DNA sequence: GGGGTACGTGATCG
DNA sequence: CGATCACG
């Protein structure tokens, strides 16, 4: 069977080729197609105003841009016949360069879809769908090691290891000698990064898996490979890595193949307080990673010495990227597929995303004209626009999870845009307490879509009950999860900022709804003896004071197994789990501690660089006395010996180091931070401060705001500098530990002597 | 060989 | 205050 892999667009003659990635059993294929064409839709004020609106230019590239073809089209608008024309273009760099032409016009109503990739409006206009079938990709984790020292340029260091594993095993390539039997000793690092190269072009994996790749690994090799004057030729069609901008991070992209990021996917998947490797293979396989600090590579790469050790630490980063891949790449493969997106933009999506491509390939399905992202007066006016947890530390806690309520909600109130106080409408449902009215007469777009899609689920899943194949169940349990991942993140979208099908009121008339299942479930458990210590709209958490927990399991077991039997249809409430301890500050600001010991925390760490040690020492130590001993008054006393500690100059000044990137160049910003200030004292003594570079200061005592006060660690003399106590003790520590105390009745103020 | 793509939050500046 | 900036 033919899958789809990936889709973009290259330029000939001026004119625009798709370009469709194929995996066609076990074989790379390329399509092309010159037919497809770009376009827009106008909403005119009248159809005479064509003849004037189909003779607007604009420039491109030194020569004129102009409208190829125009053609009136019917199409569905706010549930609504409307009339537009597609107004057709050359090339699809030509609708950014003319859009706002067309929309100035004052006969033009408004413009539609402008803003839609031309390789994405081609999978959705063509009905193509990536990963479909049973195609079997092959896949490739790659990793690197670089040699590096405090605050260095980014790529000053070189490249010492690359590391690579596959089914046929983790392997590492170097260029110093190591004994080892997966060691591949080359001559130099020119040498190496030629060997990966040879190593991906030979393998052709269809996957490559990197940990971080994004920002790390592909930046770096391609700025080591520019500097030793040598090419990345990694793409199918021989082309280079490309980096791309995503918000203010990068973006990899590997062409003819899939650049599978694993960063952003367990950073989205899992909660944890820290994203390091060896804390995400324990947490997934539970089985322990070595780590080997930056500080100890540099000392075996320099003295020759315990070579060894940083091999096998190379070795098991590409070996473990290569389980955590296989384990993470399936459910993002479902989802692509059921988004009709490609794994790569996919797996790097957040779910208000991954819905609007949903909504956006439907829309054209059904002939629904898709509304615009809001402009940047739209999209603040949005995010302008408008049950107290239980305090102390509680044990036996059970968390219940309300999420797969909603979707139910949306599809019998048929909760939609388009539905929402239409006039002459006949029969409507009213939100409680809000009032919205939601028009009965014809199903809105979203709760059809949403109708469809909990329907297909409870297809799969029938098909999993009558299915005797454990590979199809395999598949069709990753079908099943990526629906209810689709279907659950609805609810969310209606009020999301950003989204096209944003609807406030749909969101608090769901809300609204919602609420009366959620004062069910919290009578029902009230009266079975449970007290409720946190409700938020996504679940609850609750404990039957001094009971045992195996019965606080049992009955809560049972109470969900009861619930689910009286609420009718679709609506599920959910066991997510159970915990040994917990205590809750607000909403969304809580943390958790497991039978096994793991803390869980939501809203509270502060496990960042931008914060000293001293701050994340102390807020660890804090959450360890409260979680692990069940004792805040001990939190509190270590508080207070803390911050006596620092009044006293007893606290090491390597425990008081900020640590924060330059993003610029030194002239373009605007305001002069601490690590600014420092870093153009740096520039001043002729060092190469660059865009990348990393920043460690210490605020002194003194007067003057912070960024006058700080000075670079490598600077800093404990005998000539006094470190700034008041600082380290209010802006760090405190804070720091204020919100956690503050649910056992603490003040800043109740943290000192 | 393309193209808009990221947020949610909290500190510090101006 | 709003604006600016940075973390992961
Ligand atoms: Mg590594």
Same mark, same amino acid.
């Given at each position: 069977?033919?899958?789809?892999?990936?889709?973009?667009?290259?330029?000939?003659?001026?004119?625009?080729?798709?370009?469709?990635?194929? #995996?066609?059993?076990?074989?790379?294929?390329?399509?092309?197609?010159?037919?497809?064409?770009?376009?827009?839709?106008?909403?005119?004020?009248?159809?005479?105003?064509?003849?004037?609106? #189909?003779?607007?230019?604009?420039?491109?590239?030194?020569?004129?841009?102009?409208?190829?073809?125009?053609?009136?089209?019917?199409?569905?608008?706010?549930? *609504?016949?409307?009339?537009?024309?597609?107004?057709?273009?050359?090339?699809?760099?030509?609708?950014?360069?003319?859009?706002?032409?067309?929309?100035?016009?004052?006969?033009?109503?408004?413009?539609?879809?402008?803003?839609?990739?031309?390789?994405?409006?081609? !999978?959705?206009?063509?009905?193509?769908?990536?990963?479909?079938?049973?195609?079997?990709?092959?896949?490739?984790?790659?990793?690197?090691?670089?040699?590096?020292?405090?605050?260095?340029?980014?790529?000053?260091?070189?490249?010492?290891?690359?590391?690579?594993?596959?089914?046929?095993?983790?392997?590492?390539?170097?260029?110093?000698?190591?004994?080892?039997?997966?060691?591949?000793?080359?001559?130099?690092?020119?040498?190496?990064?030629?060997?990966?190269?040879?190593?991906?072009?030979?393998?052709?994996?269809?996957?490559?898996?990197?940990?971080?790749?994004?920002?790390?690994?592909?930046?770096?090799?391609?700025?080591?490979?520019?500097?030793?004057?040598?090419?990345?030729?990694?793409?199918?069609?021989?082309?280079?890595?490309?980096?791309? *901008?995503?918000?203010?991070?990068?973006?990899?992209?590997?062409?003819? %193949?899939?650049?599978? @990021?694993?960063?952003?996917?367990? $950073?989205?998947?899992?909660?944890?307080?820290?994203?390091?490797?060896?804390?995400?293979?324990?947490?997934?396989?539970? #089985?322990?990673?070595?780590?080997?600090?930056?500080?100890?590579?540099?000392?075996?790469?320099?003295?020759?010495?315990?070579?060894?050790?940083?091999?096998?630490?190379?070795?098991?980063?590409? &070996?473990?990227?290569?389980? !955590?891949?296989?384990?993470?790449?399936?459910?993002?493969?479902?989802?692509? %597929?059921?988004? /009709?997106?490609?794994?790569?933009?996919?797996?790097?999506?957040?779910?208000?995303?991954?819905?609007?491509?949903?909504?956006?390939? &439907?829309?054209?399905?059904?002939?629904?004209?898709?509304?615009?992202?809001? @402009?940047? $007066?739209?999209?603040?006016?949005?995010? %302008?626009?408008?049950?107290?947890?239980?305090?102390?530390?509680?044990?036996?806690?059970?968390?219940? +999870?309300?999420?797969?309520?909603?979707?139910?909600?949306?599809?019998?109130?048929?909760?939609?845009?388009?539905?929402?106080?239409?006039?002459?409408?006949?029969?409507?449902?009213?939100?409680?307490?809000?009032?919205?009215?939601?028009?009965?007469?014809?199903?809105?777009?979203?709760?059809?879509?949403?109708?469809?899609?909990?329907?297909?689920?409870?297809?799969?899943?029938? *098909?999993?009950?009558?299915?005797? +194949?454990?590979?199809?169940?395999?598949?069709?349990?990753? $079908?099943?999860?990526?629906?209810?991942?689709?279907?659950?993140?609805?609810?969310?979208?209606?009020?999301?900022?950003?989204?096209?099908?944003?609807?406030?009121?749909?969101?608090?008339?769901?809300?609204?709804?919602?609420?009366?299942?959620?004062?069910?479930?919290?009578?029902?458990?009230?009266?079975?003896?449970?007290?409720?210590?946190?409700?938020?709209?996504?679940?609850?958490?609750?404990?039957?004071?001094?009971?045992?927990?195996?019965?606080?399991?049992? #009955?809560?077991?049972?109470?969900?197994?009861?619930?689910?039997? &009286?609420?009718?249809?679709?609506?599920?409430?959910?066991?997510?789990?159970?915990?040994?301890?917990?205590?809750?500050?607000?909403?969304?600001?809580?943390?958790?501690?497991?039978?096994?010991?793991?803390?869980?925390? $939501?809203?509270?760490?502060?496990?960042?660089? +931008?914060?000293?040690?001293?701050?994340?020492?102390?807020?660890?130590?804090?959450?360890?006395?409260?979680?692990?001993? /069940?004792?805040? @008054?001990?939190?509190?006393?270590?508080?207070?010996?803390?911050?006596?500690?620092?009044?006293?100059?007893?606290?090491?000044?390597?425990?008081?180091?900020?640590?924060?990137?330059?993003? %610029?160049?030194?002239?373009?910003?605007?305001?002069?931070?601490?690590?600014?200030?420092?870093?153009?004292?740096?520039?001043?003594?002729?060092?190469?401060?660059?865009?990348?570079?990393?920043?460690?200061?210490?605020?002194?005592?003194?007067?003057?705001?912070?960024?006058?006060?700080?000075?670079?660690?490598?600077?800093? @003399?404990?005998?000539?500098? &006094?470190?700034?106590?008041?600082?380290?003790?209010?802006?760090?520590?405190?804070?720091?530990?204020?919100?956690?105390?503050?649910?056992?009745?603490?003040?800043?103020?109740?943290?000192?002597?």
């Amino acid at each position: 069977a033919g899958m789809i892999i990936a889709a973009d667009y290259i330029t000939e003659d001026g004119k625009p080729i798709i370009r469709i990635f194929k #995996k066609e059993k076990g074989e790379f294929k390329v399509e092309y197609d010159r037919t497809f064409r770009p376009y827009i839709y106008a909403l005119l004020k009248d159809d005479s105003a064509i003849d004037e609106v #189909k003779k607007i230019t604009a420039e491109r590239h030194g020569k004129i841009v102009r409208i190829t073809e125009v053609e009136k089209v019917q199409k569905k608008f706010l549930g *609504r016949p409307i009339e537009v024309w597609k107004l057709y273009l050359e090339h699809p760099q030509d609708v950014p360069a003319i859009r706002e032409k067309i929309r100035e016009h004052p006969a033009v109503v408004d413009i539609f879809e402008y803003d839609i990739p031309f390789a994405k409006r081609y !999978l959705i206009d063509k009905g193509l769908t990536p990963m479909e079938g049973n195609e079997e990709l092959t896949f490739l984790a790659v990793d690197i090691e670089t040699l590096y020292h405090e605050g260095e340029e980014f790529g000053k260091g070189p490249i010492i290891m690359i590391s690579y594993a596959d089914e046929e095993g983790a392997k590492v390539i170097t260029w110093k000698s190591i004994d080892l039997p997966y060691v591949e000793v080359v001559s130099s690092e020119r040498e190496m990064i030629k060997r990966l190269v040879k190593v991906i072009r030979e393998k052709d994996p269809d996957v490559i898996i990197t940990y971080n790749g994004d920002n790390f690994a592909f930046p770096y090799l391609l700025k080591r490979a520019e500097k030793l004057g040598i090419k990345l030729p990694l793409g199918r069609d021989n082309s280079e890595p490309k980096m791309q *901008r995503m918000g203010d991070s990068l973006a990899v992209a590997i062409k003819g %193949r899939i650049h599978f @990021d694993l960063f952003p996917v367990i $950073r989205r998947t899992i909660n944890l307080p820290t994203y390091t490797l060896e804390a995400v293979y324990e947490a997934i396989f539970g #089985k322990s990673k070595e780590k080997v600090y930056a500080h100890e590579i540099a000392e075996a790469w320099e003295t020759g010495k315990g070579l060894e050790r940083v091999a096998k630490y190379s070795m098991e980063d590409a &070996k473990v990227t290569f389980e !955590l891949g296989k384990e993470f790449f399936p459910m993002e493969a479902q989802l692509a %597929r059921l988004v /009709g997106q490609p794994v790569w933009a996919v797996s790097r999506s957040s779910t208000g995303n991954l819905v609007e491509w949903f909504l956006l390939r &439907k829309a054209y399905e059904r002939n629904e004209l898709a509304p615009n992202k809001p @402009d940047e $007066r739209e999209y603040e006016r949005r995010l %302008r626009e408008s049950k107290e947890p239980e305090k102390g530390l509680w044990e036996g806690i059970v968390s219940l +999870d309300f999420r797969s309520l909603y979707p139910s909600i949306i599809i019998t109130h048929n909760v939609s845009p388009d539905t929402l106080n239409r006039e002459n409408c006949k029969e409507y449902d009213v939100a409680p307490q809000v009032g919205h009215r939601f028009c009965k007469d014809f199903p809105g777009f979203i709760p059809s879509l949403l109708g469809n899609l909990l329907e297909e689920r409870q297809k799969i899943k029938k *098909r999993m009950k009558e299915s005797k +194949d454990p590979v199809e169940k395999k598949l069709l349990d990753y $079908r099943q999860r990526a629906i209810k991942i689709l279907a659950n993140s609805y609810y969310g979208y209606y009020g999301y900022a950003k989204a096209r099908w944003y609807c406030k009121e749909c969101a608090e008339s769901v809300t609204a709804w919602g609420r009366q299942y959620i004062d069910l479930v919290r009578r029902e458990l009230e009266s079975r003896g449970f007290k409720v210590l946190y409700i938020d709209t996504d679940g609850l958490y609750a404990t039957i004071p001094g009971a045992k927990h195996e019965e606080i399991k049992e #009955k809560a077991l049972k109470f969900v197994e009861y619930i689910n039997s &009286k609420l009718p249809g679709l609506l599920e409430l959910e066991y997510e789990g159970f915990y040994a301890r917990g205590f809750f500050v607000t909403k969304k600001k809580y943390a958790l501690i497991d039978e096994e010991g793991k803390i869980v925390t $939501r809203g509270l760490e502060i496990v960042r660089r +931008d914060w000293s040690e001293i701050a994340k020492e102390t807020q660890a130590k804090v959450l360890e006395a409260i979680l692990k001993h /069940g004792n805040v @008054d001990e939190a509190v006393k270590i508080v207070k010996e803390v911050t006596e500690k620092l009044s006293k100059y007893e606290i090491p000044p390597e425990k008081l180091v900020i640590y924060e990137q330059i993003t %610029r160049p030194l002239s373009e910003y605007k305001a002069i931070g601490p690590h600014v200030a420092v870093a153009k004292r740096l520039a001043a003594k002729g060092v190469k401060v660059k865009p990348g570079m990393v920043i460690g200061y210490i605020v002194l005592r003194g007067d003057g705001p912070i960024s006058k006060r700080a000075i670079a660690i490598e600077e800093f @003399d404990p005998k000539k500098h &006094k470190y700034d106590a008041e600082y380290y003790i209010e802006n760090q520590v405190l804070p720091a530990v204020e919100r956690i105390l503050r649910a056992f009745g603490y003040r800043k103020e109740d943290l000192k002597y």
